Symmetry: C3
Subunit: 45 residues, 3 copies
Amino acid sequence: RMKQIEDKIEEIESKQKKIENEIARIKKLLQLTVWGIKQLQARIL
Amino acid sequence: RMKQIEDKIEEIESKQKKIENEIARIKKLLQLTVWGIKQLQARIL
Amino acid sequence: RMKQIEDKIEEIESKQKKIENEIARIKKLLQLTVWGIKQLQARIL
């Protein structure tokens, strides 16, 4: 039972890391879009 | 105690799934904004 | 062992809350970019 719990915890932590990676990927792309909007606005103004 | 731990684990996994859903929703909207920026830039150029 | 598991669970839940905060931050910024795109498109049209 202890080993089952330990395995379950490792699984959850692995999923958490996957989620963290996805968040990092979204942040990077979101930063590119912010930059793109700034450039387009500067042209429009 | 085993049952309490099992319940706690299910709760955590449920929250993880909720988080995964939110990430998926953000990715979809972010994709729309990327497309919108591409169309606006093409008009500006 | 029970205490180790309890500590591990608290750690995981704390990370989950951190993730939730980051998601909330991304959503807010994404909302600003959606608004910016709407304003730029209205000028272009």
